[PDB]
Design an enzyme around this catalytic site. Structure first.
Site, short mmCIF file in Angstrom:
data_model
loop_
_atom_site.label_atom_id
_atom_site.label_comp_id
_atom_site.label_asym_id
_atom_site.label_seq_id
_atom_site.Cartn_x
_atom_site.Cartn_y
_atom_site.Cartn_z
N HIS A 91 55.87 1.05 44.96
CA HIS A 91 57.12 0.87 44.20
C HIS A 91 56.85 1.01 42.72
O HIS A 91 55.68 1.16 42.31
CB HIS A 91 57.78 -0.50 44.56
CG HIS A 91 56.95 -1.67 44.16
ND1 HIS A 91 56.25 -2.40 45.06
CD2 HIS A 91 56.71 -2.22 42.95
CE1 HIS A 91 55.59 -3.36 44.38
NE2 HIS A 91 55.85 -3.23 43.05
N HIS A 93 58.11 -0.37 38.53
CA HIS A 93 58.85 -1.23 37.62
C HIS A 93 59.21 -0.39 36.40
O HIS A 93 58.51 0.57 36.09
CB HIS A 93 58.10 -2.46 37.19
CG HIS A 93 57.63 -3.32 38.30
ND1 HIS A 93 58.27 -4.50 38.64
CD2 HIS A 93 56.66 -3.12 39.22
CE1 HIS A 93 57.57 -5.02 39.69
NE2 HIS A 93 56.69 -4.19 40.09
N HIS A 116 53.02 0.67 41.29
CA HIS A 116 52.24 -0.26 42.12
C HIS A 116 52.03 0.31 43.51
O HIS A 116 53.03 0.56 44.19
CB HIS A 116 52.91 -1.63 42.16
CG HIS A 116 52.91 -2.32 40.85
ND1 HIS A 116 53.69 -3.39 40.53
CD2 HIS A 116 52.11 -2.07 39.76
CE1 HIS A 116 53.40 -3.80 39.31
NE2 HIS A 116 52.42 -2.99 38.79
C1 LIG Z 1 55.42 -12.17 50.32
C2 LIG Z 1 54.97 -10.95 51.07
C3 LIG Z 1 54.70 -9.80 50.14
C4 LIG Z 1 56.05 -9.26 49.67
N1 LIG Z 1 56.04 -8.13 48.93
C5 LIG Z 1 56.26 -6.81 49.23
O1 LIG Z 1 56.70 -6.40 50.31
N2 LIG Z 1 55.95 -5.97 48.21
C6 LIG Z 1 55.35 -6.42 46.99
C7 LIG Z 1 56.05 -7.06 45.98
C8 LIG Z 1 55.50 -7.16 44.70
C9 LIG Z 1 54.23 -6.71 44.51
S1 LIG Z 1 53.58 -6.51 42.89
N3 LIG Z 1 54.83 -6.20 41.95
O2 LIG Z 1 52.74 -5.33 43.03
O3 LIG Z 1 53.04 -7.78 42.50
C10 LIG Z 1 53.49 -6.17 45.55
C11 LIG Z 1 54.07 -6.00 46.78
ZN LIG Z 2 55.21 -4.35 41.51
#
Ligand SMILES: CCCCNC(=O)Nc1ccc(S(N)(=O)=O)cc1
Ligand SMILES: [Zn+2]
Length: 257
Positions: A91, A93, A116
Site C-alpha cells: 500500500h 501513504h 509499504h
Molecule cells: C493487525 C493486523 C495487521 C493489519 N494490517 C494490514 O493488513 N496491513 C498493514 C497496515 C499498516 C502497515 S504499515 N503502514 O506498513 O505500518 C502494514 C500493514
Molecule cells: Zn503503511
C-alpha cells in the site's frame, strides 16, 4: 472510529490505543549522522511470484493490494533477518500537498508519498493474525517517493483504482510482482518499530530504502481522488493518510551501507 481527520487522527489515537505513546513507534526521522553501519547486515533478498497477487481493496483511509499468503511463493529474506517473511500486501501513504506525504523522513526531509511492502514471519507463526502482535512478526519495506517524473511501474495499480472508488469496494488484482516498484539499489536502514496506524502494534522490523522512486503530481492526485465514503454518500476524498514521525526513545537505526 479512527482516521486521519482532526477528531479521530494521529494526535488522538492514544485515547483508544495507548501504545501510540510507546517506545517502538513508527515512523521516525532517520538522522544519517546518528545511524550505525552494521557489518553483519546481509543484502535484502526479495523473490515474489506474480501469481500470488489477489485483490485490491478500498479500506476507507487507503487502499490495500493483497497477496495469497498460504505458502512461500513470495518471500523476503536477508538484511537483518534469520527467518523467511511471506509477502501479504502493499500500500501507499500520501499527504494533502506534494510537500509532505511520506511517513519516514530522512534528515528532516519530507517526501511526497511512501510505498509499504508488508510481510509476516512464516518461520515462527502460522498466520498474519498470529504474527501481527509479535515483536518478530512483521517486516515492512518502505520506499520514499519523490515527486517528479511519472512512474510507469505504478500503471496497473493506478488503472485499478476506478473499480474501487468508494469504501468497501474490492476487485481482483492478479499477475503482479511488486518487486518491480522497488528502487535499483536495495541499500537500506533498519530499525525496530510499529504499524503506523491502529492497532499500532510494535511488531514491525522496518527496512527503509536509501534510494527513492519517482511519482508525478498527477499520479498523487489519483490517490487523493479515492473516496473514503461508501457508495451513495457525500463524496469525501482521501486527502492524506501519513502519520507524523515519533520519538526514537533510545532506538538505533542501522545502515547496510
Ligand atoms: C493487525 C493486523 C495487521 C493489519 N494490517 C494490514 O493488513 N496491513 C498493514 C497496515 C499498516 C502497515 S504499515 N503502514 O506498513 O505500518 C502494514 C500493514
Ligand atoms: Zn503503511
Amino acid at each position: 472510529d479512527w482516521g486521519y481527520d482532526d477528531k479521530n487522527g494521529p494526535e488522538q489515537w492514544s485515547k483508544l490505543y495507548p501504545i501510540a505513546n510507546g517506545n517502538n513507534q513508527s515512523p521516525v526521522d532517520i538522522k544519517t549522522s546518528e545511524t550505525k553501519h552494521d557489518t553483519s547486515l546481509k543484502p535484502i533478498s526479495v523473490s515474489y511470484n506474480p501469481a500470488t497477487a489477489k485483490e485490491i481493496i478500498n479500506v476507507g483511509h487507503s487502499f490495500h493490494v493483497n497477496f495469497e499468503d498460504n505458502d512461500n511463493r513470495s518471500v523476503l529474506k536477508g538484511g537483518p533477518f534469520s527467518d523467511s517473511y511471506r509477502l501479504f500486501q502493499f500500500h501507499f501513504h500520501w499527504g494533502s500537498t506534494n510537500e509532505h506525504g511520506s511517513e519516514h523522513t530522512v534528515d528532516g526531509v519530507k517526501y511526497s508519498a511512501e510505498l509499504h511492502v508488508a510481510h509476516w514471519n512464516s518461520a515462527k507463526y502460522s498466520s498474519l493474525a498470529e504474527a501481527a502482535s509479535k515483536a518478530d512478526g512483521l517486516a515492512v519495506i518502505g520506499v520514499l517517493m519523490k515527486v517528479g517524473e511519472a512512474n510507469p511501474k505504478l500503471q496497473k495499480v493506478l488503472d485499478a483504482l476506478q473499480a474501487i472508488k468508494t469504501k468497501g469496494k474490492r476487485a481482483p488484482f492478479t499477475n503482479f510482482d511488486p518487486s518491480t516498484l522497488l528502487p535499483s539499489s536495495l541499500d537500506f536502514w533498519t530499525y525496530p518499530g510499529s504499524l503506523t496506524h491502529p492497532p499500532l502494534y510494535e511488531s514491525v522490523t522496518w527496512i527503509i530504502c536509501k534510494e527513492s522512486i519517482s511519482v508525478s503530481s498527477e499520479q498523487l492526485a489519483q490517490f487523493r481522488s479515492l473516496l473514503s465514503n461508501v457508495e451513495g454518500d457525500n463524496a469525501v476524498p482521501m486527502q492524506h493518510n501519513n502519520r507524523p514521525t515519533q520519538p526514537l526513545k533510545g532506538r538505533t537505526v542501522r545502515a547496510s551501507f
